[PDB]
Design a protein around this ligand. Structure first.
Ligand SMILES: CO[C@@H]1O[C@H](CS[C@@H]2O[C@H](CO)[C@@H](O)[C@H](O)[C@H]2O)[C@@H](O)[C@H](O)[C@H]1O
Ligand SMILES: CC(=O)N[C@@H]1[C@@H](O)[C@H](O)[C@@H](CO)O[C@H]1O
Ligand SMILES: CC(=O)N[C@@H]1[C@@H](O)[C@H](O)[C@@H](CO)O[C@H]1O
Ligand SMILES: CC(=O)N[C@@H]1[C@@H](O)[C@H](O)[C@@H](CO)O[C@H]1O
Length: 606
């Protein structure tokens, strides 16, 4: 179609499939295997990206150009990498991926939304869609086009260190929250074929349904372990939300480190090719987890030649290497050269990668938009996060006896009030994991409002607010306080570091609640990624709120405490009496919860 040096794949007016086929048919083996290779920014240079025809980059948790980097610094980094990729013979743009799983959370100044478990407590799929929309804008503010979200794990045991990344133990809730996908990517058109990838354009991002499949079903909640369940249970609990994701055009799917009945997901041809591709008709690309292919073997990495063979034959399309690209490319090239992996398999992987890139507009807008930088941390997005935080809160108790005056909502005007606890003024703790670092961190790690700051912003000017992190009983009795707000809970974690067999919060936590509540009426705000042993906290407290990991906008907490809005959140998970009961989920035979899934007290707004 017209000029003498015309190249069909570069023509934006042509159908995606025609562009894919046109480009595929010109590519060398090295160019093909390049597309299948994703590397860490930490090992990328312009020559590396050119010379190896690299298809994708990522930032793993905490992989940042520098601490405190501006949106523009991120854009310039991504563009620098893209410039090298566009300078190859075929000029295939790279796609840059990142864990934007509760906002653009590796980035300083990014709006941090509540983690998934709290979003499940909202029962508000449209809220979650709007969070996807806002997150896409903040990811594109940093020049990034691809988010490794949503985690649609159905966490069946809260001892798992990633349970907070699951909307619920009930697959129906997880299914409802797949609305994140069209928020991130845009709504699919009227006549859309389930399983096709979709991204609307340069103001949206490619999404990733992860981790396929049964990541939330592992024995004793051990991260990356074995999920022992028959096909019927796999298909009834862990699979359904993947079909919803297909219906909404999710662009990519990431494979789980976990195994199903002893078979590594990263080597499972029956599930990856037979089910996801051949039965659900998924036409986007399948990506490994981080060194996921390495971990097929025991020990990990002990037969990388086998890792590459098993994974690519299983049907994986792009490998998150993420460091040893030379070895990955060398081994896969050798396998193809020796007939161990057929060209049909390579061509399928590349067809899928290119399909996603053409569909999302990446060949038309390979570079960042500097006018998008100002989307980072935008007040409109913080207002949305604040709404979500407030809606996520589950009121578990509001009075020690049925005859007591309800403590909540608290009055904004009082002569003197106490704010206490390890989690009352610690932004990192209220954000939890996947915030600035993978494991999260402590203290003022980004821009936000702590619970203490939110209290001070809310109360009448005449109200004196005293902070004490861990006051003793005498301090509280002597203080002339009208009431106290005390916040305690879990420290930030992810993955295996979060795996926890006892689920009791660190001290001082309980001891501070006991000291405060022993001296004055108290509302305890429990910050956690999951249910934790709570009877002792309940016994001490007049009121208690499960606030989960509410993110940067602590005013969400105080919006409910002071009655600007009523409490509406409902448990998205069973609250156990004892860890000895676990696993224990709604619908089980022996179901003996402290609080059943769906439980939540309410209040009315003042
Ligand atoms: C800094 O990168 C590494 O992060 C991983 C987290 S594990 C794996 O990582 C993917 C890419 O960030 C995620 O999309 C996926 O959900 C995770 O399962 C960790 O293993 C390393 O500690 C860390 O260096
Ligand atoms: C399939 C799988 O991941 N199994 C692991 C096993 O290899 C390991 O010894 C055990 C204790 O760490 O956890 C589980
Ligand atoms: C009371 C108790 O034993 N708590 C433990 C804690 O010390 C440990 O750091 C964590 C690691 O999983 O498990 C829990
Ligand atoms: C403390 C309080 O006002 N509780 C009320 C309840 O009595 C009423 O039935 C409901 C519907 O209006 O609103 C709430």
């Amino acid at each position: 179609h017209h000029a003498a040096d015309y190249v069909l794949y570069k023509d934006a007016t042509k159908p995606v499939e025609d562009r894919v086929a046109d480009l595929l048919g010109r590519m060398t083996l090295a160019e093909k295997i390049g597309q299948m290779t994703q590397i860490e920014r930490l090992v990328a240079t312009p020559d590396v990206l050119r010379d190896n025809f690299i298809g994708s980059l990522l930032s793993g948790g905490g992989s940042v150009p520098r601490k405190g980097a501006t949106a523009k610094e991120w854009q310039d980094m991504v563009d620098g990498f893209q410039k090298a990729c566009m300078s190859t013979r075929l000029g295939i743009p790279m796609i840059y991926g990142i864990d934007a799983v509760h906002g653009q959370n590796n980035v300083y100044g990014a709006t941090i939304f509540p983690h998934n478990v709290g979003l499940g407590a909202t029962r508000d799929p449209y809220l979650v869609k709007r969070i996807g929309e806002a997150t896409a804008l903040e990811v594109r503010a940093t020049g990034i086009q691809y988010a490794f979200a949503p985690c649609i794990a159905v966490c069946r045991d809260p001892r798992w260190g990633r349970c907070y990344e699951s909307y619920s133990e009930d697959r129906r809730i997880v299914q409802s929250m797949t609305e994140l996908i069209p928020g991130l990517q845009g709504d699919v058109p009227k006549d859309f074929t389930s399983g096709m990838p979709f991204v609307a354009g340069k103001n949206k991002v490619a999404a990733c349904a992860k981790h396929f499949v049964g990541d939330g079903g592992t024995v004793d909640g051990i991260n990356e372990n074995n999920t022992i369940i028959n096909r019927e249970g796999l298909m009834n609990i862990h699979m359904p939300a993947y079909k919803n994701a297909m219906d909404k055009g999710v662009s990519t799917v990431m494979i789980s480190y976990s195994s199903w009945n002893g078979v590594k997901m990263h080597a499972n041809q029956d599930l990856v090719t037979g089910y996801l591709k051949d039965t659900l008709k998924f036409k986007g690309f399948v990506i490994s987890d981080w060194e996921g292919i390495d971990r097929i073997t025991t020990p990990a990495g002990s037969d990388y030649s086998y890792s590459v063979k098993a994974s690519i034959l299983a049907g994986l399309d792009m490998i998150m290497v993420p460091n040893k690209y030379q070895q990955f490319i060398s081994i896969l090239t050798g396998h193809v050269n020796g007939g161990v992996i057929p060209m049909s398999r390579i061509d399928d992987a590349v067809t899928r990668i290119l399909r996603v890139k053409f569909t999302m507009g990446l060949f038309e807008n390979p570079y960042a938009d500097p006018a998008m930088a100002e989307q980072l941390g935008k007040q409109e997005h913080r207002d949305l996060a604040r709404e979500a935080a407030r809606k996520s809160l589950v009121l578990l108790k509001n009075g020690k006896t049925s005859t007591d005056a309800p403590l909540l909502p608290l009055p904004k005007k009082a002569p003197k009030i106490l704010v206490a606890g390890s989690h009352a003024d610690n932004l990192g703790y209220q954000c939890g994991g996947w915030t600035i670092e993978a494991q999260g961190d402590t203290g003022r790690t980004t821009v936000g409002t702590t619970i203490l700051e939110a209290v001070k912003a809310a109360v009448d000017p005449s109200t004196v607010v005293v902070f004490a992190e861990n006051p003793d009983a005498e301090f509280v009795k002597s203080g002339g306080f009208s009431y106290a707000i005390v916040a305690v809970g879990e420290h930030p974690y992810t993955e295996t570091k979060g795996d926890n067999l006892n689920l009791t919060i660190p001290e001082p936590g309980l001891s501070t609640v006991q000291a405060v509540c022993g001296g004055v009426r108290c509302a305890t705000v429990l910050i956690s990624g999951r249910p934790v042993v709570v009877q002792p906290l309940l016994a001490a407290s007049d009121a208690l709120v499960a606030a989960w990991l509410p993110g940067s906008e602590g005013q969400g907490v105080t919006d409910a405490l002071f009655g600007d809005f009523g409490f509406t959140g409902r448990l998205p998970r069973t609250w156990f009496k004892s860890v000895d009961q676990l696993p224990m989920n709604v619908g089980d035979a022996h179901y003996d919860p402290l609080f059943r899934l769906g439980y939540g007290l309410t209040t009315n707004a003042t």
